[PDB]
Design a protein around this ligand. Structure first.
Ligand SMILES: Nc1ncnc2c1ncn2[C@@H]1O[C@H](COP(=O)(O)OP(=O)(O)OP(=O)(O)O)[C@@H](O)[C@H]1O
Ligand SMILES: Nc1ncnc2c1ncn2[C@@H]1O[C@H](COP(=O)(O)OP(=O)(O)OP(=O)(O)O)[C@@H](O)[C@H]1O
Ligand SMILES: [Mg+2]
Ligand SMILES: [Mg+2]
Lengths: 368, 368
């Protein structure tokens, strides 16, 4: 076995939170407080060790406590083949992200991906159903990159090239009516986009299969995922084929690209649709049935993460115990066995955690 | 004591999942209840359509049409302070034809429906006003004001019309030459309208500030302040004579920017107002329930202001706002609802048991 595990966390100058070191027990860490406390703030610091950014999309500026110049998070983690691993996040108001794993500072922020695995269940996950393709596309990358460093690299390269190619368009439109030498980037974008498309396709087939079963078991509704990729393909097939399609679309779209100084073809503007019972759930569905869609989305994220990486993530549940009754809660609890849980709530006298913490002014306090 | 706004009956034909029917409601608390995805919000949406001329959810007209149909039609009979029974009729055929009639008479422009039937709608998706972009806020401010202020709503139409006008001149200046002369006037026009909007917007925001504080004070004890980032940088001013120049002013300085982006950059279509809670911008730093509180307050204040500037007393649409309560506020605000017509959606018949209650299933509403 040997599942993941946040042994302890130390946070200095982090958001609301006073400077403190907290030790956690594996299983369910109930955390209760009241809107000026830092429940979500703790959960944030924890995921920061996992992704190296805020799950609430916040600037690393705002993580820094009011009127300070820096903040520091340290965490002690057990992987499956790691008895103990130290992850360190430090930021100063200079603009210096510093990230050490076992004393060894990391080259780029992205290398923090993988060392500590979390799945964060936020009620704001509902936005992946509701917002535009940008929100869904980001989410998609985040799911894959935590599983596949290859995909991550390709993304980064892809964007660099895209950004270069955009500059080159600017100069072409204005300073010289013709560069064919735009050809070299088109070729590069096509070659990278195709690998990106081919991997996204691979993830989404899994999400189809996985979410379908959840969506079916939960509410008897038929799930369907439609990947709106840049190749314009219904089935995905050969990476080579995608490469040739992307390149062509890139040639035929030049004019539009010169009108806008943007690149219209490419995985930087794909999207997937989530059809519940044949209809777009972004356009046609009940609040409650968007909620359910988002829930199965998260379930599948987790299920796939265990499947692909042999590890069992640390589950963070922020403000979900609210929307539930009593037998529906211990039901959920029972599904959380093999996992270390960090669960925020608002009452202690309700859900019985393997150890729990009251939090009042930014100070965590065990067994209360 | 004037007669409250009161919705006697509604007829819906081909409106979302809702069957063809005519329902008759109570002066008082109409409790609409049912399982989810049955049509409670749809129904609430049809109501507010009569009040607002569009979907409160932002959906587009074509999507309101029942699936695989050619039109939809809604009829309301309302009692205002000066009316015993007013007909408001709304129809849309999927050829894009919008048709509104009040008491038989087809209205000239859709906007003219504003003010006849007065509703205030409270949904959980009100949080978004606190924590999305300047779009969401600017727009909700426009909606709030235009309902009370027929005049402003005309100002606004005329602003966006010559704004769009101006931006098409920009695509004929740095693209095709000349255009210099004709440019002079638009700036005067944009500045004339703009300053109307600004004075009025400021008016409402001062009222918003005052009312909201009083609420936010009573409810969570936090201190509210409100900053109106007007387009004329004239923080803390009140005389339209001068704001016209500043806009005419800033509109010249930003000429080359304007030309670079082919958009206009200075005016009230780029404004926003910040909702500070205890000194801190709540877009950025507020908690979650800290926004649930900020939202409810925003709404409460809307209702309050609305009552006192129209001399009416709106219908209250309470969309799925009652799941998340404690019975010490659920049996409370029920008392607060007394003088008004409430539509309250829920999923349980058991005690939110107001003055009347219908049960909806499969788009059909029966009365117990
Ligand atoms: N940089 C910061 N410095 C200090 N406090 C901050 C900072 N950013 C956010 N906060 C504060 O954190 C406080 C509450 O923390 P958090 O954001 O975790 O809410 P919460 O206690 O989890 O409550 P809820 O149940 O409402 O989610 C808020 O009052 C907010 O102003
Ligand atoms: N144009 C349409 N034609 C047919 N059905 C639609 C249309 N638009 C939305 N629906 C469907 O209406 C059903 C219910 O809509 P609505 O949002 O009113 O559900 P709801 O009753 O609000 O859910 P809840 O019961 O949680 O309030 C959903 O299944 C939705 O997919
Ligand atoms: Mg929270
Ligand atoms: Mg709904």
């Amino acid at each position: 076995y040997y599942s993941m595990y946040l042994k302890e966390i130390f946070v200095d100058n982090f958001r609301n939170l006073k400077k403190q070191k907290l030790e956690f027990c594996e299983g369910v860490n109930l955390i209760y407080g009241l809107n000026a406390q830092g429940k979500s703030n703790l959960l944030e610091a924890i995921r920061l060790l996992s992704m190296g950014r805020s799950f609430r999309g916040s600037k690393m500026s705002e993580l820094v406590k009011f009127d300070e110049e820096y903040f520091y998070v340290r965490g002690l983690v057990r992987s499956a083949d790691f008895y103990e691993k130290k992850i360190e996040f430090g930021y100063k108001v200079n603009g210096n992200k510093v990230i050490k794993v076992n004393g060894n500072k990391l080259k780029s922020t992205g290398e923090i991906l993988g060392h500590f695995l979390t799945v964060i269940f936020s009620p704001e996950d509902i936005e992946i159903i509701k917002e535009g393709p940008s929100r869904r596309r980001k989410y998609l990358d985040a799911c894959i990159s935590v599983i596949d460093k290859n995909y991550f690299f390709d993304l980064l390269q892809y964007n660099k090239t895209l950004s270069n190619r955009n500059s080159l368009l600017k100069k072409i439109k204005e300073e010289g009516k013709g560069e064919d030498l735009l050809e070299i980037f088109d070729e590069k974008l096509a070659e990278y986009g195709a690998r990106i498309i081919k991997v996204r396709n691979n993830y989404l087939e899994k999400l189809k299969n996985s979410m379908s079963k959840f969506l079916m078991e939960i509410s008897n509704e038929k799930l369907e995922i439609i990947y709106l990729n840049s190749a314009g393909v219904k089935e995905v097939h050969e990476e080579n084929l995608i490469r040739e399609k992307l390149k062509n679309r890139l040639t035929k779209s030049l004019t539009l690209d010169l009108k806008y100084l943007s690149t219209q073809v490419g995985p930087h503007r794909e999207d997937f649709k989530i059809l519940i019972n044949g209809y777009d759930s972004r356009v046609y569905s009940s609040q409650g049935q968007k909620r359910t869609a988002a829930l199965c989305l998260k379930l599948s994220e987790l299920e796939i993460l265990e499947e692909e990486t042999g590890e069992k993530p640390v589950l963070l549940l922020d403000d979900v115990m609210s929307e539930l009754d009593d037998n529906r809660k211990k039901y959920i609890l029972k599904k959380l066995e093999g996992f270390q849980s960090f669960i925020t709530h608002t009452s202690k006298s309700d859900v019985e955690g393997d150890c729990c913490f009251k939090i009042y002014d930014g100070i965590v306090d065990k067994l209360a």
